Amino acid sequence: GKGKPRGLNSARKLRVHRRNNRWAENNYKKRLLGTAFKSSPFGGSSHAKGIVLEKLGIESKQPNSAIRKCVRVQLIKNGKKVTAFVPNDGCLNFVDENDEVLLAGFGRKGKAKGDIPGVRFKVVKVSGVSLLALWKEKKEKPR
Amino acid sequence: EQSNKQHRKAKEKNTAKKKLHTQGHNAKAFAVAAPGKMARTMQRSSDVN
RNA sequence: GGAUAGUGGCCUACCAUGGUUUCAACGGGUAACGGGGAAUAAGGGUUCGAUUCCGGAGAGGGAGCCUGAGAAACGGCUACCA
RNA sequence: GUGAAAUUCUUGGAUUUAUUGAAGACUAACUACUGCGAAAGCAUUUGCCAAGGACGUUUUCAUUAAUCAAGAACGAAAGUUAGGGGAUCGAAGAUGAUCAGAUACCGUCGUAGUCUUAACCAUAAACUAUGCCGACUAGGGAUCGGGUGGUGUUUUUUUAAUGACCCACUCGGCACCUUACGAGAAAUCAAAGUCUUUGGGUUCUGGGGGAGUAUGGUCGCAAGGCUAAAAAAGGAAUUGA
């Protein structure tokens, strides 16, 4: 009889049974309590603001390697420091110190030949203007 | 040699229902009425903060 | 009986001890205005609907009233708090 | 008495023999792939008290039923409280020997307990490691209980029981042997099956191992508060120089 009732007056039992087991599902619980954005990489937001502490890997020799691309920024709603990629050592010249970057996720699909694991954030804007605009020389970084 | 099989005994705690009720209050009871609305306003508010 | 435009524990007397509920009362949460409607999948469903129309509610927040057929009105008045 | 001995007790004669008497337990072989009970469980005889399955029935009421939280009954062994006796064995404990080997790690005594009455405790590998009720789907013999028929042998005859074996059929059990035109990961399964994707009724439940980490999520647990020390061939050696 497949465990469930089947009678034509059994909708009440069916409905309450399904309500209990819906609560016992996993993602339903997160979606109703509001904890998916507590499991999100840095809370709910899409991007995340930070202060550039130090440009790491400046004393490396071989250019355009990932340890040269890396920086170390501290997120401002946590006081919590974490690293971040910056493409193009030119853009590494653009980001110096006390800069208020806007990190975002990395979202890679495949690795590279010299990539660092666990560096999950990249830099989108610096001091209010976009890194790509600064690199393409559309704009100018205002101090 | 001998091959004496060993046996599983019982569980301790892997149930979503008791995982909810294990607080002093009821995590099932303290909930909301429009979870998708709550999700998109949480997104937008976190971005503005 | 009073009061109201009028029914009515609406309110005052004097009376009986009743009313709701495992068919979930009561109390809690709601980032809860309700609906026509919007999106999606094959069907079933699920999620949105502050927002061009309809209805209700409000005018910083308790409370109170004047005029008037119509208001507990706030681009009316009075006292309190902020 | 062990593998080996030793504590132990024996001229007031142990161990042994005979004749007994007392005590409290226990109910051997007979004992089965048999039986009873809702399960845990249940074995000497006889009697009493109630109860129950199954069969048989041209008896009787006429849906009175199935599944089901709450609660209730019962629940091995050990365990607790208060009584009883206390033979046997015996967690703790006290001891003997610590002998090579543990191949062949014990012995002696014994508190609680074992047993019994009255109350608690409510747990087991409490297992067919598998919710219940109903129905259908293979053959084969058995064995237990009841019944029907026949056939003889054992039986006995106006006395109080007319039972036993054989065979055929039949219900209802405990099981078993072959296999599935089925199912499956496969072992296997007469149900874990009911023609490819799904509806006979119904209660409960769900969304692997070790590791490494953080804990405000939590329960528990500690210590002391007069008390001190300062380099060697300046060797080895029945083996040397």
mmCIF file of all heavy atoms in Angstrom, chain D residues 42-58:
data_model
loop_
_atom_site.group_PDB
_atom_site.id
_atom_site.type_symbol
_atom_site.label_atom_id
_atom_site.label_comp_id
_atom_site.label_asym_id
_atom_site.label_seq_id
_atom_site.Cartn_x
_atom_site.Cartn_y
_atom_site.Cartn_z
ATOM 1 P P C D 42 12.191 -21.383 31.696
ATOM 2 O OP1 C D 42 12.412 -21.470 33.152
ATOM 3 O OP2 C D 42 13.276 -21.729 30.757
ATOM 4 O "O5'" C D 42 10.950 -22.321 31.383
ATOM 5 C "C5'" C D 42 9.792 -22.287 32.197
ATOM 6 C "C4'" C D 42 8.709 -23.173 31.647
ATOM 7 O "O4'" C D 42 8.423 -22.814 30.275
ATOM 8 C "C3'" C D 42 9.044 -24.646 31.569
ATOM 9 O "O3'" C D 42 8.892 -25.294 32.813
ATOM 10 C "C2'" C D 42 8.070 -25.145 30.520
ATOM 11 O "O2'" C D 42 6.787 -25.320 31.092
ATOM 12 C "C1'" C D 42 7.998 -23.954 29.567
ATOM 13 N N1 C D 42 8.827 -24.125 28.354
ATOM 14 C C2 C D 42 8.349 -24.931 27.325
ATOM 15 O O2 C D 42 7.256 -25.481 27.473
ATOM 16 N N3 C D 42 9.075 -25.094 26.204
ATOM 17 C C4 C D 42 10.241 -24.477 26.092
ATOM 18 N N4 C D 42 10.932 -24.661 24.969
ATOM 19 C C5 C D 42 10.753 -23.640 27.115
ATOM 20 C C6 C D 42 10.017 -23.492 28.216
ATOM 21 P P A D 43 10.170 -25.880 33.578
ATOM 22 O OP1 A D 43 9.698 -26.452 34.860
ATOM 23 O OP2 A D 43 11.230 -24.848 33.572
ATOM 24 O "O5'" A D 43 10.648 -27.085 32.663
ATOM 25 C "C5'" A D 43 11.060 -28.313 33.250
ATOM 26 C "C4'" A D 43 10.084 -29.425 32.955
ATOM 27 O "O4'" A D 43 9.903 -29.517 31.519
ATOM 28 C "C3'" A D 43 10.528 -30.805 33.417
ATOM 29 O "O3'" A D 43 9.396 -31.577 33.797
ATOM 30 C "C2'" A D 43 11.161 -31.393 32.167
ATOM 31 O "O2'" A D 43 11.145 -32.801 32.111
ATOM 32 C "C1'" A D 43 10.314 -30.784 31.058
ATOM 33 N N9 A D 43 11.073 -30.579 29.831
ATOM 34 C C8 A D 43 11.798 -29.481 29.468
ATOM 35 N N7 A D 43 12.383 -29.605 28.307
ATOM 36 C C5 A D 43 12.017 -30.871 27.886
ATOM 37 C C6 A D 43 12.301 -31.617 26.734
ATOM 38 N N6 A D 43 13.057 -31.183 25.731
ATOM 39 N N1 A D 43 11.780 -32.849 26.635
ATOM 40 C C2 A D 43 11.009 -33.288 27.629
ATOM 41 N N3 A D 43 10.674 -32.693 28.761
ATOM 42 C C4 A D 43 11.210 -31.473 28.819
ATOM 43 P P U D 44 9.061 -31.764 35.353
ATOM 44 O OP1 U D 44 7.834 -30.998 35.665
ATOM 45 O OP2 U D 44 10.305 -31.510 36.107
ATOM 46 O "O5'" U D 44 8.718 -33.306 35.502
ATOM 47 C "C5'" U D 44 9.569 -34.297 34.958
ATOM 48 C "C4'" U D 44 9.470 -35.567 35.754
ATOM 49 O "O4'" U D 44 10.238 -35.431 36.980
ATOM 50 C "C3'" U D 44 8.074 -35.907 36.236
ATOM 51 O "O3'" U D 44 7.288 -36.548 35.250
ATOM 52 C "C2'" U D 44 8.350 -36.765 37.454
ATOM 53 O "O2'" U D 44 8.756 -38.065 37.060
ATOM 54 C "C1'" U D 44 9.560 -36.052 38.047
ATOM 55 N N1 U D 44 9.180 -34.992 39.008
ATOM 56 C C2 U D 44 8.498 -35.271 40.179
ATOM 57 O O2 U D 44 8.131 -36.372 40.545
ATOM 58 N N3 U D 44 8.225 -34.179 40.957
ATOM 59 C C4 U D 44 8.556 -32.872 40.711
ATOM 60 O O4 U D 44 8.238 -32.003 41.514
ATOM 61 C C5 U D 44 9.262 -32.662 39.499
ATOM 62 C C6 U D 44 9.539 -33.703 38.722
ATOM 63 P P U D 45 5.757 -36.121 35.040
ATOM 64 O OP1 U D 45 5.319 -36.689 33.750
ATOM 65 O OP2 U D 45 5.607 -34.673 35.298
ATOM 66 O "O5'" U D 45 4.988 -36.897 36.186
ATOM 67 C "C5'" U D 45 5.141 -38.295 36.319
ATOM 68 C "C4'" U D 45 4.493 -38.797 37.577
ATOM 69 O "O4'" U D 45 5.140 -38.207 38.727
ATOM 70 C "C3'" U D 45 3.030 -38.439 37.755
ATOM 71 O "O3'" U D 45 2.176 -39.322 37.052
ATOM 72 C "C2'" U D 45 2.853 -38.520 39.260
ATOM 73 O "O2'" U D 45 2.712 -39.870 39.667
ATOM 74 C "C1'" U D 45 4.204 -38.016 39.758
ATOM 75 N N1 U D 45 4.210 -36.587 40.133
ATOM 76 C C2 U D 45 3.570 -36.172 41.277
ATOM 77 O O2 U D 45 2.940 -36.905 42.013
ATOM 78 N N3 U D 45 3.669 -34.837 41.537
ATOM 79 C C4 U D 45 4.340 -33.894 40.805
ATOM 80 O O4 U D 45 4.331 -32.724 41.173
ATOM 81 C C5 U D 45 4.990 -34.404 39.653
ATOM 82 C C6 U D 45 4.910 -35.699 39.374
ATOM 83 P P U D 46 0.827 -38.792 36.370
ATOM 84 O OP1 U D 46 0.222 -39.929 35.649
ATOM 85 O OP2 U D 46 1.121 -37.533 35.657
ATOM 86 O "O5'" U D 46 -0.119 -38.451 37.597
ATOM 87 C "C5'" U D 46 -0.612 -39.478 38.439
ATOM 88 C "C4'" U D 46 -1.212 -38.909 39.697
ATOM 89 O "O4'" U D 46 -0.196 -38.200 40.447
ATOM 90 C "C3'" U D 46 -2.301 -37.872 39.504
ATOM 91 O "O3'" U D 46 -3.563 -38.438 39.222
ATOM 92 C "C2'" U D 46 -2.268 -37.118 40.819
ATOM 93 O "O2'" U D 46 -2.930 -37.863 41.826
ATOM 94 C "C1'" U D 46 -0.778 -37.114 41.132
ATOM 95 N N1 U D 46 -0.115 -35.863 40.711
ATOM 96 C C2 U D 46 -0.249 -34.757 41.512
ATOM 97 O O2 U D 46 -0.904 -34.745 42.534
ATOM 98 N N3 U D 46 0.392 -33.640 41.066
ATOM 99 C C4 U D 46 1.150 -33.520 39.938
ATOM 100 O O4 U D 46 1.681 -32.448 39.665
ATOM 101 C C5 U D 46 1.252 -34.708 39.170
ATOM 102 C C6 U D 46 0.631 -35.807 39.576
ATOM 103 P P G D 47 -4.655 -37.585 38.420
ATOM 104 O OP1 G D 47 -5.807 -38.477 38.147
ATOM 105 O OP2 G D 47 -3.962 -36.890 37.308
ATOM 106 O "O5'" G D 47 -5.142 -36.491 39.467
ATOM 107 C "C5'" G D 47 -5.896 -36.876 40.604
ATOM 108 C "C4'" G D 47 -6.026 -35.758 41.608
ATOM 109 O "O4'" G D 47 -4.722 -35.328 42.068
ATOM 110 C "C3'" G D 47 -6.667 -34.475 41.121
ATOM 111 O "O3'" G D 47 -8.077 -34.560 41.025
ATOM 112 C "C2'" G D 47 -6.194 -33.472 42.158
ATOM 113 O "O2'" G D 47 -6.939 -33.615 43.354
ATOM 114 C "C1'" G D 47 -4.773 -33.961 42.422
ATOM 115 N N9 G D 47 -3.794 -33.215 41.621
ATOM 116 C C8 G D 47 -3.109 -33.653 40.526
ATOM 117 N N7 G D 47 -2.309 -32.751 40.035
ATOM 118 C C5 G D 47 -2.495 -31.654 40.855
ATOM 119 C C6 G D 47 -1.905 -30.376 40.812
ATOM 120 O O6 G D 47 -1.075 -29.953 40.009
ATOM 121 N N1 G D 47 -2.371 -29.554 41.820
ATOM 122 C C2 G D 47 -3.291 -29.921 42.756
ATOM 123 N N2 G D 47 -3.624 -28.998 43.661
ATOM 124 N N3 G D 47 -3.852 -31.112 42.811
ATOM 125 C C4 G D 47 -3.409 -31.920 41.835
ATOM 126 P P C D 48 -8.869 -33.634 39.981
ATOM 127 O OP1 C D 48 -10.284 -34.066 39.974
ATOM 128 O OP2 C D 48 -8.116 -33.593 38.707
ATOM 129 O "O5'" C D 48 -8.815 -32.189 40.640
ATOM 130 C "C5'" C D 48 -9.465 -31.945 41.875
ATOM 131 C "C4'" C D 48 -9.163 -30.565 42.390
ATOM 132 O "O4'" C D 48 -7.737 -30.417 42.593
ATOM 133 C "C3'" C D 48 -9.514 -29.426 41.455
ATOM 134 O "O3'" C D 48 -10.885 -29.089 41.486
ATOM 135 C "C2'" C D 48 -8.612 -28.311 41.947
ATOM 136 O "O2'" C D 48 -9.144 -27.722 43.121
ATOM 137 C "C1'" C D 48 -7.354 -29.086 42.330
ATOM 138 N N1 C D 48 -6.338 -29.085 41.256
ATOM 139 C C2 C D 48 -5.583 -27.936 41.025
ATOM 140 O O2 C D 48 -5.786 -26.935 41.722
ATOM 141 N N3 C D 48 -4.656 -27.954 40.051
ATOM 142 C C4 C D 48 -4.472 -29.051 39.331
ATOM 143 N N4 C D 48 -3.545 -29.031 38.380
ATOM 144 C C5 C D 48 -5.220 -30.232 39.545
ATOM 145 C C6 C D 48 -6.129 -30.204 40.514
ATOM 146 P P C D 49 -11.592 -28.543 40.159
ATOM 147 O OP1 C D 49 -13.051 -28.517 40.400
ATOM 148 O OP2 C D 49 -11.040 -29.300 39.014
ATOM 149 O "O5'" C D 49 -11.074 -27.046 40.037
ATOM 150 C "C5'" C D 49 -11.341 -26.095 41.054
ATOM 151 C "C4'" C D 49 -10.529 -24.846 40.852
ATOM 152 O "O4'" C D 49 -9.119 -25.170 40.861
ATOM 153 C "C3'" C D 49 -10.731 -24.148 39.523
ATOM 154 O "O3'" C D 49 -11.886 -23.336 39.512
ATOM 155 C "C2'" C D 49 -9.440 -23.367 39.354
ATOM 156 O "O2'" C D 49 -9.471 -22.174 40.119
ATOM 157 C "C1'" C D 49 -8.423 -24.309 39.989
ATOM 158 N N1 C D 49 -7.668 -25.126 39.012
ATOM 159 C C2 C D 49 -6.635 -24.555 38.270
ATOM 160 O O2 C D 49 -6.387 -23.353 38.417
ATOM 161 N N3 C D 49 -5.938 -25.323 37.408
ATOM 162 C C4 C D 49 -6.233 -26.611 37.286
ATOM 163 N N4 C D 49 -5.526 -27.344 36.426
ATOM 164 C C5 C D 49 -7.265 -27.219 38.036
ATOM 165 C C6 C D 49 -7.945 -26.448 38.882
ATOM 166 P P A D 50 -13.093 -23.683 38.520
ATOM 167 O OP1 A D 50 -14.126 -22.628 38.649
ATOM 168 O OP2 A D 50 -13.454 -25.106 38.708
ATOM 169 O "O5'" A D 50 -12.444 -23.528 37.080
ATOM 170 C "C5'" A D 50 -12.825 -22.458 36.236
ATOM 171 C "C4'" A D 50 -11.705 -21.471 36.061
ATOM 172 O "O4'" A D 50 -10.495 -21.982 36.671
ATOM 173 C "C3'" A D 50 -11.296 -21.205 34.631
ATOM 174 O "O3'" A D 50 -12.173 -20.336 33.947
ATOM 175 C "C2'" A D 50 -9.884 -20.679 34.801
ATOM 176 O "O2'" A D 50 -9.906 -19.358 35.312
ATOM 177 C "C1'" A D 50 -9.374 -21.601 35.902
ATOM 178 N N9 A D 50 -8.777 -22.820 35.336
ATOM 179 C C8 A D 50 -9.214 -24.104 35.505
ATOM 180 N N7 A D 50 -8.500 -24.999 34.876
ATOM 181 C C5 A D 50 -7.533 -24.246 34.246
ATOM 182 C C6 A D 50 -6.470 -24.598 33.414
ATOM 183 N N6 A D 50 -6.186 -25.849 33.059
ATOM 184 N N1 A D 50 -5.689 -23.612 32.952
ATOM 185 C C2 A D 50 -5.962 -22.358 33.301
ATOM 186 N N3 A D 50 -6.931 -21.906 34.075
ATOM 187 C C4 A D 50 -7.689 -22.908 34.518
ATOM 188 P P A D 51 -12.751 -20.784 32.522
ATOM 189 O OP1 A D 51 -13.904 -19.921 32.194
ATOM 190 O OP2 A D 51 -12.935 -22.251 32.549
ATOM 191 O "O5'" A D 51 -11.559 -20.462 31.522
ATOM 192 C "C5'" A D 51 -10.954 -19.185 31.542
ATOM 193 C "C4'" A D 51 -9.607 -19.167 30.875
ATOM 194 O "O4'" A D 51 -8.693 -20.087 31.518
ATOM 195 C "C3'" A D 51 -9.555 -19.592 29.430
ATOM 196 O "O3'" A D 51 -10.068 -18.620 28.542
ATOM 197 C "C2'" A D 51 -8.074 -19.862 29.250
ATOM 198 O "O2'" A D 51 -7.361 -18.645 29.171
ATOM 199 C "C1'" A D 51 -7.729 -20.515 30.580
ATOM 200 N N9 A D 51 -7.758 -21.979 30.472
ATOM 201 C C8 A D 51 -8.616 -22.855 31.066
ATOM 202 N N7 A D 51 -8.380 -24.103 30.757
ATOM 203 C C5 A D 51 -7.301 -24.038 29.899
ATOM 204 C C6 A D 51 -6.575 -25.017 29.218
ATOM 205 N N6 A D 51 -6.830 -26.319 29.295
ATOM 206 N N1 A D 51 -5.556 -24.628 28.440
ATOM 207 C C2 A D 51 -5.291 -23.326 28.360
ATOM 208 N N3 A D 51 -5.900 -22.312 28.951
ATOM 209 C C4 A D 51 -6.910 -22.739 29.714
ATOM 210 P P G D 52 -10.810 -19.078 27.197
ATOM 211 O OP1 G D 52 -11.320 -17.858 26.539
ATOM 212 O OP2 G D 52 -11.727 -20.200 27.494
ATOM 213 O "O5'" G D 52 -9.636 -19.644 26.292
ATOM 214 C "C5'" G D 52 -8.606 -18.784 25.848
ATOM 215 C "C4'" G D 52 -7.525 -19.537 25.124
ATOM 216 O "O4'" G D 52 -6.914 -20.525 25.986
ATOM 217 C "C3'" G D 52 -7.966 -20.351 23.935
ATOM 218 O "O3'" G D 52 -8.248 -19.559 22.803
ATOM 219 C "C2'" G D 52 -6.789 -21.284 23.757
ATOM 220 O "O2'" G D 52 -5.686 -20.572 23.227
ATOM 221 C "C1'" G D 52 -6.467 -21.613 25.206
ATOM 222 N N9 G D 52 -7.156 -22.836 25.646
ATOM 223 C C8 G D 52 -8.257 -22.886 26.443
ATOM 224 N N7 G D 52 -8.658 -24.094 26.680
ATOM 225 C C5 G D 52 -7.772 -24.895 25.994
ATOM 226 C C6 G D 52 -7.725 -26.304 25.888
ATOM 227 O O6 G D 52 -8.480 -27.135 26.393
ATOM 228 N N1 G D 52 -6.678 -26.730 25.096
ATOM 229 C C2 G D 52 -5.789 -25.889 24.497
ATOM 230 N N2 G D 52 -4.838 -26.479 23.775
ATOM 231 N N3 G D 52 -5.818 -24.570 24.584
ATOM 232 C C4 G D 52 -6.835 -24.137 25.347
ATOM 233 P P G D 53 -9.198 -20.129 21.653
ATOM 234 O OP1 G D 53 -9.707 -18.967 20.901
ATOM 235 O OP2 G D 53 -10.158 -21.086 22.242
ATOM 236 O "O5'" G D 53 -8.194 -20.925 20.718
ATOM 237 C "C5'" G D 53 -7.083 -20.255 20.155
ATOM 238 C "C4'" G D 53 -6.104 -21.209 19.536
ATOM 239 O "O4'" G D 53 -5.610 -22.133 20.532
ATOM 240 C "C3'" G D 53 -6.643 -22.104 18.448
ATOM 241 O "O3'" G D 53 -6.739 -21.437 17.205
ATOM 242 C "C2'" G D 53 -5.641 -23.247 18.448
ATOM 243 O "O2'" G D 53 -4.447 -22.856 17.792
ATOM 244 C "C1'" G D 53 -5.333 -23.376 19.934
ATOM 245 N N9 G D 53 -6.157 -24.384 20.613
ATOM 246 C C8 G D 53 -7.047 -24.030 21.575
ATOM 247 N N7 G D 53 -7.675 -25.032 22.095
ATOM 248 C C5 G D 53 -7.155 -26.118 21.440
ATOM 249 C C6 G D 53 -7.484 -27.465 21.625
ATOM 250 O O6 G D 53 -8.318 -27.901 22.413
ATOM 251 N N1 G D 53 -6.775 -28.312 20.791
ATOM 252 C C2 G D 53 -5.839 -27.856 19.900
ATOM 253 N N2 G D 53 -5.240 -28.809 19.176
ATOM 254 N N3 G D 53 -5.518 -26.580 19.720
ATOM 255 C C4 G D 53 -6.210 -25.758 20.522
ATOM 256 P P A D 54 -8.060 -21.566 16.308
ATOM 257 O OP1 A D 54 -7.962 -20.600 15.203
ATOM 258 O OP2 A D 54 -9.259 -21.612 17.166
ATOM 259 O "O5'" A D 54 -7.919 -22.988 15.639
ATOM 260 C "C5'" A D 54 -6.747 -23.332 14.932
ATOM 261 C "C4'" A D 54 -6.661 -24.817 14.786
ATOM 262 O "O4'" A D 54 -6.397 -25.404 16.077
ATOM 263 C "C3'" A D 54 -7.946 -25.471 14.348
ATOM 264 O "O3'" A D 54 -8.124 -25.409 12.951
ATOM 265 C "C2'" A D 54 -7.796 -26.878 14.890
ATOM 266 O "O2'" A D 54 -6.900 -27.622 14.086
ATOM 267 C "C1'" A D 54 -7.101 -26.612 16.208
ATOM 268 N N9 A D 54 -8.023 -26.493 17.346
ATOM 269 C C8 A D 54 -8.335 -25.363 18.036
ATOM 270 N N7 A D 54 -9.145 -25.539 19.037
ATOM 271 C C5 A D 54 -9.374 -26.892 19.008
ATOM 272 C C6 A D 54 -10.168 -27.712 19.811
ATOM 273 N N6 A D 54 -10.885 -27.258 20.833
ATOM 274 N N1 A D 54 -10.199 -29.025 19.542
ATOM 275 C C2 A D 54 -9.489 -29.459 18.495
ATOM 276 N N3 A D 54 -8.701 -28.790 17.664
ATOM 277 C C4 A D 54 -8.690 -27.495 17.980
ATOM 278 P P C D 55 -9.586 -25.259 12.328
ATOM 279 O OP1 C D 55 -9.441 -25.078 10.878
ATOM 280 O OP2 C D 55 -10.357 -24.274 13.093
ATOM 281 O "O5'" C D 55 -10.209 -26.694 12.537
ATOM 282 C "C5'" C D 55 -9.627 -27.800 11.883
ATOM 283 C "C4'" C D 55 -10.089 -29.095 12.480
ATOM 284 O "O4'" C D 55 -9.942 -29.050 13.905
ATOM 285 C "C3'" C D 55 -11.546 -29.428 12.284
ATOM 286 O "O3'" C D 55 -11.780 -29.977 11.008
ATOM 287 C "C2'" C D 55 -11.812 -30.409 13.412
ATOM 288 O "O2'" C D 55 -11.333 -31.691 13.050
ATOM 289 C "C1'" C D 55 -10.893 -29.886 14.502
ATOM 290 N N1 C D 55 -11.538 -29.169 15.617
ATOM 291 C C2 C D 55 -12.327 -29.835 16.547
ATOM 292 O O2 C D 55 -12.577 -31.034 16.477
ATOM 293 N N3 C D 55 -12.797 -29.194 17.627
ATOM 294 C C4 C D 55 -12.584 -27.894 17.743
ATOM 295 N N4 C D 55 -13.063 -27.298 18.828
ATOM 296 C C5 C D 55 -11.771 -27.184 16.829
ATOM 297 C C6 C D 55 -11.264 -27.858 15.799
ATOM 298 P P G D 56 -13.095 -29.593 10.192
ATOM 299 O OP1 G D 56 -13.028 -30.304 8.905
ATOM 300 O OP2 G D 56 -13.287 -28.134 10.226
ATOM 301 O "O5'" G D 56 -14.256 -30.244 11.042
ATOM 302 C "C5'" G D 56 -14.376 -31.649 11.134
ATOM 303 C "C4'" G D 56 -15.462 -32.026 12.094
ATOM 304 O "O4'" G D 56 -15.081 -31.641 13.426
ATOM 305 C "C3'" G D 56 -16.778 -31.321 11.885
ATOM 306 O "O3'" G D 56 -17.544 -31.911 10.860
ATOM 307 C "C2'" G D 56 -17.426 -31.423 13.252
ATOM 308 O "O2'" G D 56 -17.966 -32.719 13.431
ATOM 309 C "C1'" G D 56 -16.224 -31.299 14.166
ATOM 310 N N9 G D 56 -16.038 -29.961 14.735
ATOM 311 C C8 G D 56 -15.089 -29.051 14.407
ATOM 312 N N7 G D 56 -15.147 -27.973 15.127
ATOM 313 C C5 G D 56 -16.187 -28.204 15.998
ATOM 314 C C6 G D 56 -16.722 -27.400 17.024
ATOM 315 O O6 G D 56 -16.383 -26.276 17.393
ATOM 316 N N1 G D 56 -17.770 -28.024 17.669
ATOM 317 C C2 G D 56 -18.235 -29.262 17.359
ATOM 318 N N2 G D 56 -19.256 -29.715 18.076
ATOM 319 N N3 G D 56 -17.748 -30.022 16.411
ATOM 320 C C4 G D 56 -16.734 -29.431 15.775
ATOM 321 P P U D 57 -18.284 -30.983 9.798
ATOM 322 O OP1 U D 57 -18.847 -31.816 8.721
ATOM 323 O OP2 U D 57 -17.361 -29.881 9.487
ATOM 324 O "O5'" U D 57 -19.498 -30.399 10.621
ATOM 325 C "C5'" U D 57 -20.398 -31.272 11.269
ATOM 326 C "C4'" U D 57 -21.308 -30.519 12.191
ATOM 327 O "O4'" U D 57 -20.582 -30.019 13.326
ATOM 328 C "C3'" U D 57 -21.942 -29.281 11.614
ATOM 329 O "O3'" U D 57 -23.019 -29.585 10.768
ATOM 330 C "C2'" U D 57 -22.354 -28.519 12.858
ATOM 331 O "O2'" U D 57 -23.558 -29.040 13.387
ATOM 332 C "C1'" U D 57 -21.227 -28.872 13.818
ATOM 333 N N1 U D 57 -20.268 -27.771 13.971
ATOM 334 C C2 U D 57 -20.571 -26.970 15.025
ATOM 335 O O2 U D 57 -21.526 -27.181 15.742
ATOM 336 N N3 U D 57 -19.737 -25.930 15.256
ATOM 337 C C4 U D 57 -18.635 -25.629 14.490
ATOM 338 O O4 U D 57 -17.959 -24.651 14.802
ATOM 339 C C5 U D 57 -18.387 -26.510 13.395
ATOM 340 C C6 U D 57 -19.198 -27.537 13.168
ATOM 341 P P U D 58 -22.826 -29.519 9.190
ATOM 342 O OP1 U D 58 -22.366 -30.827 8.680
ATOM 343 O OP2 U D 58 -22.051 -28.297 8.918
ATOM 344 O "O5'" U D 58 -24.287 -29.245 8.660
ATOM 345 C "C5'" U D 58 -24.661 -27.924 8.344
ATOM 346 C "C4'" U D 58 -26.017 -27.557 8.874
ATOM 347 O "O4'" U D 58 -27.019 -27.970 7.923
ATOM 348 C "C3'" U D 58 -26.406 -28.159 10.219
ATOM 349 O "O3'" U D 58 -27.051 -27.175 11.013
ATOM 350 C "C2'" U D 58 -27.411 -29.242 9.853
ATOM 351 O "O2'" U D 58 -28.395 -29.449 10.837
ATOM 352 C "C1'" U D 58 -28.029 -28.695 8.572
ATOM 353 N N1 U D 58 -28.524 -29.706 7.626
ATOM 354 C C2 U D 58 -27.700 -30.647 7.052
ATOM 355 O O2 U D 58 -26.520 -30.764 7.269
ATOM 356 N N3 U D 58 -28.296 -31.505 6.180
ATOM 357 C C4 U D 58 -29.611 -31.529 5.806
ATOM 358 O O4 U D 58 -29.999 -32.372 5.002
ATOM 359 C C5 U D 58 -30.405 -30.525 6.424
ATOM 360 C C6 U D 58 -29.836 -29.673 7.270
#
